[PDB]
Amino acid sequence: MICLGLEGTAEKTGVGIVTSDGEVLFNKTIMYKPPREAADHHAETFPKLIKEAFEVVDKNEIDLIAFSQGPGLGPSLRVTATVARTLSLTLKKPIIGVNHCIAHIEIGKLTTEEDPLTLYVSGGNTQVIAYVSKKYRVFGETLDIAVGNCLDQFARYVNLPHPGGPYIEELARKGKKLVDLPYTVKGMDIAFSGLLTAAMRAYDAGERLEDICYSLQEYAFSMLTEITERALAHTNKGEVMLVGGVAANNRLREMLKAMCEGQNVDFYVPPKEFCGDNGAMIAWLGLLMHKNGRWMSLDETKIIPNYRTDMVEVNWI
């Protein structure tokens, strides 16, 4: 019994094939390169990825199909859902919708080490998540822009190539002087719009690019670290887990590691392929729910563009 999972909530079209034993029979992704939409990229890429998936393993082998229902863009979720429905009907095999953020959390848990308070930071979604009282809730989140989104916007303004995560990281690696920008932390929330605006102003002031980038990364990762600390105190989680694309930054990784060591807790990040938006996470989560009796029908597979982690039901735990 194995599953084939599709991730299309964002610019990344990911196709994976995952077994019930926990292994990954196959995995691959394509990151949409903005010059169309993420939905068009999903439509034009899922055929090729699925053909490759059959090439690796016979199409008759995959016992389940899973797709990222949400949260995420509208058209992208539409395309992934329709492709998954077509696959399920053609193979006459079950189809299941999975929560993409919960997929991130679960793939991270599987590919590393239990119940990690998960800082999910990406280019369109930043929030701290944790499984408490039988449901995965957001214990903190942005209010205007996402940390990855803010860094990417800063990159476009400063002409840094897309993506700017690893680029801003390398430019901050050689920074000493800190510019003054607002440090907005409302309870367990952040407003990266203020930070992005302040960085815009500082850049408009002729500040050293390295200095401003270092300051922005320090600010943003510091607030993320602080809300992660607050959510750890709130939840007493046994380990932080940085997930999403922005996990590629060693600067953020070391700030989180320093925090967690200070709090006598462990900080984890899974492999590079699994951190980003992969099909393997979708396949793993869909098969996780299928293993415990999550029977979904055609009528139940509509898209949920604002799918909240609190809108999910979890039995796999």
């Binding site: 863009l73 209010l143 800190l178 932390v185 309870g187 367990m188 320090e218 670290t225 989180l256």
Partner: protein, 178 residues
Amino acid sequence: DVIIKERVKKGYRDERLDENIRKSRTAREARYLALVKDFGIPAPYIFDVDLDNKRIMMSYINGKLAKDVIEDNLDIAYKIGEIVGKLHKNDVIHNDLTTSNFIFDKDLYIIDFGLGKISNLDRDKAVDLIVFKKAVLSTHHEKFDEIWERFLEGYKSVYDRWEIILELMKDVERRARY
């Protein structure tokens, strides 16, 4: 009695900005915990201040935190509404309201004010209302409706322009994906 509060230098962050933020937060907390009593809001007294050491020594209040008994005694929700509408009327924009920034022994004091700010922006007030709503929902979702209703009743009692900002609040709540 009296207690001393310090903004320790968290190692994980940059020492320069760490000290800068600790100093700024200590200064803002002192200034606004003092200015809050100009509006009749109970609060601890600032007996002594130390910016260099980031140590502020203030009166100690022997009362259960709001988050501890707010659900058990819903009237504390009304009191929080009153002592937040006082802030908003006076434009002292508390940016980090939670049910842990208040103590209840005989009267409801406001303990922490680290992130406070003076602003006449109703949008900011709506944002901070949403912040408190999210905090109370996360901590005691089981009683979010009743606690929120009593808090808004207090807000109405003390603050008059509430509706305007409350309308604004709804708009801010509508910041999601189509």
